[PDB]
Every structure is written in structure tokens, then in C-alpha cells.
Amino acid sequence: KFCRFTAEGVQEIDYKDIATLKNYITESGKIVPSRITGTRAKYQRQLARAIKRARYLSLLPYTDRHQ
Amino acid sequence: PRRRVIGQRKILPDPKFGSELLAKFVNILMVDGKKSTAESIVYSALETLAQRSGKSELEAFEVALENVRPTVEVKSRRVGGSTYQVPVEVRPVRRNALAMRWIVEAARKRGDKSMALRLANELSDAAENKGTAVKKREDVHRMAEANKAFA
Amino acid sequence: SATIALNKRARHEYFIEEEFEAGLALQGWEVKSLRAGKANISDSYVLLRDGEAFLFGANITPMAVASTHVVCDPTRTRKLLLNQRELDSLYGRVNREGYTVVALSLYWKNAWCKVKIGVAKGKKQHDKRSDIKEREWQVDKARIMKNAHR
Amino acid sequence: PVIKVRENEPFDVALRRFKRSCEKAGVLAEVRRREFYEKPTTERKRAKASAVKRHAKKLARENARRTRLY
Amino acid sequence: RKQVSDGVAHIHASFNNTIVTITDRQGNALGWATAGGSGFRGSRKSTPFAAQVAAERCADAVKEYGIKNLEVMVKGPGPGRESTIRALNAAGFRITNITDVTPIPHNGCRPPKKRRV
RNA sequence: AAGGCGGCCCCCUGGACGAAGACUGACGCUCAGGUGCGAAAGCGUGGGGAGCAAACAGGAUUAGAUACCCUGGUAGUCCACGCCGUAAACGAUGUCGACUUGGAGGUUGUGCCCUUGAGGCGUGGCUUCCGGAGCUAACGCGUUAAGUCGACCGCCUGGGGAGUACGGCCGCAAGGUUAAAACUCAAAUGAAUUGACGGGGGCCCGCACAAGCGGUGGAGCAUGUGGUUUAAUUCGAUGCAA
Numbered sequence A: 001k002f003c004r005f006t007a008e009g010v011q012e013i014d015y016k017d018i019a020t021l022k023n024y025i026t027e028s029g030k031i032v033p034s035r036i037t038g039t040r041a042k043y044q045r046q047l048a049r050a051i052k053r054a055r056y057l058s059l060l061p062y063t064d065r066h067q
Numbered sequence B: 001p002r003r004r005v006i007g008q009r010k011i012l013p014d015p016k017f018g019s020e021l022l023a024k025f026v027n028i029l030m031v032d033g034k035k036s037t038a039e040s041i042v043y044s045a046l047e048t049l050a051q052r053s054g055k056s057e058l059e060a061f062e063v064a065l066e067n068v069r070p071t072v073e074v075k076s077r078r079v080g081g082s083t084y085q086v087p088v089e090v091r092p093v094r095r096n097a098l099a100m101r102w103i104v105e106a107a108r109k110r111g112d113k114s115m116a117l118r119l120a121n122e123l124s125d126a127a128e129n130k131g132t133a134v135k136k137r138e139d140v141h142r143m144a145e146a147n148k149a150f151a
Numbered sequence C: 001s002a003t004i005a006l007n008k009r010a011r012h013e014y015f016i017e018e019e020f021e022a023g024l025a026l027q028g029w030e031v032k033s034l035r036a037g038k039a040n041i042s043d044s045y046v047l048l049r050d051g052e053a054f055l056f057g058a059n060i061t062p063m064a065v066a067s068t069h070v071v072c073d074p075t076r077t078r079k080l081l082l083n084q085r086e087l088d089s090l091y092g093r094v095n096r097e098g099y100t101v102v103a104l105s106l107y108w109k110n111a112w113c114k115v116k117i118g119v120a121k122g123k124k125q126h127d128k129r130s131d132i133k134e135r136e137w138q139v140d141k142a143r144i145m146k147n148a149h150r
Numbered sequence D: 001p002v003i004k005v006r007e008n009e010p011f012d013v014a015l016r017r018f019k020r021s022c023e024k025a026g027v028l029a030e031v032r033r034r035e036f037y038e039k040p041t042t043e044r045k046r047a048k049a050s051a052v053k054r055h056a057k058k059l060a061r062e063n064a065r066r067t068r069l070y
Numbered sequence E: 001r002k003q004v005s006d007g008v009a010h011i012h013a014s015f016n017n018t019i020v021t022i023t024d025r026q027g028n029a030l031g032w033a034t035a036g037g038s039g040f041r042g043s044r045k046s047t048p049f050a051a052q053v054a055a056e057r058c059a060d061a062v063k064e065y066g067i068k069n070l071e072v073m074v075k076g077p078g079p080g081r082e083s084t085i086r087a088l089n090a091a092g093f094r095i096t097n098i099t100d101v102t103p104i105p106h107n108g109c110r111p112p113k114k115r116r117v
Numbered sequence F: 001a002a003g004g005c006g007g008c009c010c011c012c013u014g015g016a017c018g019a020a021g022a023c024u025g026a027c028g029c030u031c032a033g034g035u036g037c038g039a040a041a042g043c044g045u046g047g048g049g050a051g052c053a054a055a056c057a058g059g060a061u062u063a064g065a066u067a068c069c070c071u072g073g074u075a076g077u078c079c080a081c082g083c084c085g086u087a088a089a090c091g092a093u094g095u096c097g098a099c100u101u102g103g104a105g106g107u108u109g110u111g112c113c114c115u116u117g118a119g120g121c122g123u124g125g126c127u128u129c130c131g132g133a134g135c136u137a138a139c140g141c142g143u144u145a146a147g148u149c150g151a152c153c154g155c156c157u158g159g160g161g162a163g164u165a166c167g168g169c170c171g172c173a174a175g176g177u178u179a180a181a182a183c184u185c186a187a188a189u190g191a192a193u194u195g196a197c198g199g200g201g202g203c204c205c206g207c208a209c210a211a212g213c214g215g216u217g218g219a220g221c222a223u224g225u226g227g228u229u230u231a232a233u234u235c236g237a238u239g240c241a242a
Ligand SMILES: [Mg+2]
Pocket: E112
């Protein structure tokens, strides 16, 4: 059910990658729900953790403004 | 009113001139079904104010009527003691009728020599935007902007 | 202000439309207690007989027993001070088998006691329920309108 | 949330883009639920009721197509 | 006194009132208006027309500073989230940003209990 | 296992499932006493306390409002060690075994096929919805049975009195646990059916409102009703429908 991974076989989303990871967050720094992304239950679940790690490491913003 | 969308009944052809607006005005003015007396009075006031103004009779009546035909009124579709008032723009069909009703209401307010003289002054000053109908219209128009929170 | 004991339970029980500010005729201890001494207006009605609409229902706490020669009682039929112009309405629309006249409040005016009286019908539980229903429903409708408007 | 007007943009479309961005982000819908406190008991109740209704409406709509030709 | 070229408008709309204020660049406010201070009070002041009038009154009290651009920051849920913007645009301003700032907690402090009206 | 558990990271650890492989050889299920865990509220000690909030203060509606609403606000909610062991602790369904038609899914493994797309064919674990036979007073359950059985434990025998008092135990306390008797009653009950009602929802009609017009209530005039007075003011009609 990993629509964005069927032809790639990544099998593990890494928080280091941002180029193919910023497509799963909207302009306001919110994760696009799997209901819309069409992502597998495990792949979306680990991608959320990867995005959280990136936010902790200041790779992705928490909010749009983030003053 | 609920399921029927009525049309409109034809008005008198106005034998003197041929103005359906004049027919509507005389029908509003007349009371108790006494058409003869009301028509005579309105014709006499018709002549007096036309000869007082100087211009053409109907061409002056139309310009005096369009100057106190209102544009937006205030209504209240609320139930209970508390009420909210909403402005509604009048359609052209009801605009002339409301203007004529205001004119005839303001006519019976002066102690002149006769009803024709009562009509004449308040009919002629409408062209110059004076009298009682114009006075109430310039406040009805202000009522719309008095509280225009909901429209 | 000058307001003294008023009956609001009767005001709730009735929907009075009549308001007469007629006065009252009293003895000494009556006005003594009315100035200070708790004259009670609860359970008040008139007793129109001849031209003598006594306020039958009215209690009072006596100031003292100074008037020892004659023994008085709080339960006295206090008379009424009303114009003959309006006394005809009481001569008339009081005998309707369902109409009464009751006292609402009692106050002072230039050291004279005036007891307000009014003509009422009487509410039975099934219309008090409707009155409370409407009272709460107006509030609920206004609240719903405000919530919808946001 | 952050909507900067591009070069030579009408005010109407500039405000419309802001409104659409706010609607997509769901800002007005978050305050309406964070204004008051909702206990976990009623939160789970509402979630279960919403899921049941969403399931039932879809089932009824799909099952009503194979009946009542017109 | 001073003359600023461009500023930042702030909106603090709610379900009862609307506050529009003007800042120069950094945090120094140089003009503000409210819906309750424009004649409207109680239920009427929560209407978007009150917010629109307050925005006009605030824009008419900033002429001394002579600003021309307004980086608007909309905050608070209320009818004044668009009427104030319309009034500011009609008052002759060239807005540069339409930023929306909202204090949405991340499941932080407990909100007050629900009203059992 | 239940209660319950939601940023991220680290340290220790319990539990569940599957591909293939060998042994241990009935070691297997349940359980009166007993022990342990056990929502929140509550109590003791030592801290912490931003927001919320019992008690409490003020305002407001109401005949009254010791409430619902508004403005503040203490215990509490938080941390560590301690105490009670109460819940609609609910799937109102005690644990295990096998047998008894299907469809649509959810999550998580595994074998093979040209894996050109979340292509297909099988097989397991958990769980959701619909439903056949069967069961039930009905609602409903329906391979995760409330279908037919087997092994074990607990409980029920009319509604009140009452899970109340006494009595034994636990507990600093609040209280928990085991648990009656006298007296009264002809019922107390649950699933469903037809009406009626809802300050429940949806749709529709009528001068019922909205846009008019004219009147009534104001002051005599012609009538009937109520009470008044008299010997009678003869009797009936007493909401809309007098
Ligand atoms: Mg509040």
C-alpha cells in the first residue's frame, strides 16, 4: 500500500532525506494524512516518526510562522 | 402565497392620457370605490400644479415621482419581542406603488382650500425635492445605513 | 426607597393588568408598625360589599401592648381610599367567577400609606407551565440565533 | 497561514487565496474544538458515533442504488 | 510625529469584539481602534459591520505617520477577519502580506469547561 | 489479563505472531480459601502549583434559584513513598477445547508466480460491518455465537425494607467486605405493538403570518351576557364552537 514506494523499494524512510520528505508536509508544517497521501499504514507511521526527528533536528519547521 | 405564483391584473387604460402609472396613482388615491370624485380631484390638482410648474404635465409628474421613489427599505423577519431589521432593495414594480402611497399619505396633511390644493403643493415640491414625502424618504434611506450589520 | 412589604408571589401567580395606587385607612398601631414593625401584605384581597372594599387579607406585627385599655388584633379589615371615578370598575368587573382583586405592594407618599391593588384572573398550573415554557423558549431562541450567526 | 501577495495581484484574488489557505489549513475549525474542554469519554463517544454514521451512510447509499429504477 | 513608510496591521478578532492596531516595524504601536469604542456595544459590536467601522476609524488615525503598505496579521476567530481587510483595502493601502497568526496550543494547557446552557 | 497506554532519544524488561528444523513426552483446563494487580475520587508525609476547578465570595434570571450563566477563587488535578479497594471496572456476555453455510473490509507476517501500479493465486494471528441455518419472549447473537456439547468456579429464587442494622475482618479516617430479621403490597419487571405528547427532526396546506385596505378598543346612540336591586327581572346557551 506504499504508493510512493512501490517502484522504489526504499522500505525505510530516513529523516536525513528532505527532498522526498517535504512533500508529506503542508505549507503550515502539518503532515498530510495517509487518507489523502495513499500511504501504507506502516510506511506512514514510520514517516511520521522521521518527520518528528527532522523537526527535532531543525530540518523541518513545526509551524508555518515559527517566530 | 405558498404554492401559487400569481401574475398581475391589467390596469385601466387611463383614458385621459394613457399612463398606467397614473391609473395606479388614481386607484391608490380613490377610497370607498368613489372613482368619480377622486378622479375629478386628482385631475384638478393635475392641472393646477402643471400650470404652476410650467413644463409638460406628465413629463413633470414623472420627474417629480422619480425624485421620491425610494430605493431600499427596512423590514424585519424576526419573531418575538427582540427584532433584527434587514434592508431590502425594492423592485421597480413596488417602487412606484410605494412612492404613490407615500405621496397620497402626505397629501392629506395640509389644511388648504380643497383636496386639490392639498395635493398640488406636495405634488409640485417633489420635483424640487421638498415637502413631506421627500422628507420621509430621505429618512427612510438613512434607516438603511442606521444599522446595516445584516443584509 | 419608600417601598415596603410587597407580594411578588401573587404577582407571579397572576397576570394583573390593573394598577390602582389607592390608599389605606389605619389606626395608630397600624401606622406605627408600618413605619417600622413589619406589616405583612401576603394573602391580600378586597371584600367589596357596599362601598366598603376592605383589605381583608393583611397581617401586621404590633409594635407593643401600650394600648392596654382596649385589646386589638392584627387581623383587621383595613378600609380603602379610592376615587369613586375608578370604584365603579370594582363595583362591576369583580364578580366573574374567576376574577379577583389583590394587593401588589405598599409604599409611602408624603407620610401616607398607599397600597397598590389590581384586578387579576388566576393562573392554574397548565398555563403557568406555558408561561415558563415561553419565557425559557425566547431565551433559547435568542441563544440559538446568536450561535448560528457567530 | 503566511500568504504573501505576488506582484500585480488584485485584492479580491489575494484575499481569496488567503481564505482558501486558511480553509485548507483548518484554523477556524481548531479553535471551535479547543475553546472548551472535552473529556476522553465523550471524545471517544463522538469518534465512534462519527465512524458508525460514516459507515452507515455509505452502506445505505451503495445499497439504495440497486432499487427504485427512477 | 515621525513618518513611517510601511507598517504592520494586527487584528485581534473574537466572538464578542474586534481590535485593529497598527505597528511600525518592530513592535511600536502607533494607532488602534476597537468595535466597542465606535458606538456599537453588546450584541451589535460583535457584528462584522462594527469591525469594518473600527478599521476605518483606525486607518483615519494613522494619517500623520503617512504609511502606505500594511503587512496584515489576522488573529482570532470572528466576523472581523475579512471586514477589516476590506476596509483597509478601501482606505487606500497596498498590503504586502496577509499573514494569519493564531495561538493554537499543541495540546497544552487545559481549556475551561464546556457551558451547560 | 483488566484498569490503561499518544512528541522525540537512551537504559532495563514483559507479552504476541510467522517461514523450516529436532526433543520433553500428558508435564494438560478450571478453581472454594489465599496472594497480586487494579479508572478516578479520597487520606498521611515532603515538595510543586501555569491552566482548569469542588467548597466559598460577588453579579445575573426567576415568586423563590443555597443551581444551570458570568467574574474570581481553596483542596484537588502534578512529583516520590505510603493507605482504601470502590465504577455503567460494559461486549451488562466468567477460562479452555473441537465441531457448524458466506460476503465486504482493517492491521500484521509468510510461499510462489514476467512484482510493467497498493499484479494474482494460498496460508496464519487480531479486529469491524452485513447476514444464512440454528437460538431467544423479542430486540438481537450469528465461526470472535447469545447455534449443538464437554471440564470447572461464582451467582439468582417477588418488589420495598437493604446490600440496611447487628455481628467478625480490613482500613489513620472516609468507608469496604460477610450479611439478615420484623412489617407492607398485589404486583414490581424487559422486548415489541397502536395511539398521544416533545421547549425532536423532515415535508406540505389554510387571510395563519409577511405586503396592503377598512374597522373594533375612544363618546353618546340599538342589542345580549355577568353582578347589583326588586316580588319577578321567567328558563336555556357559559371557550374557539355563548
Ligand atoms: Mg468563557
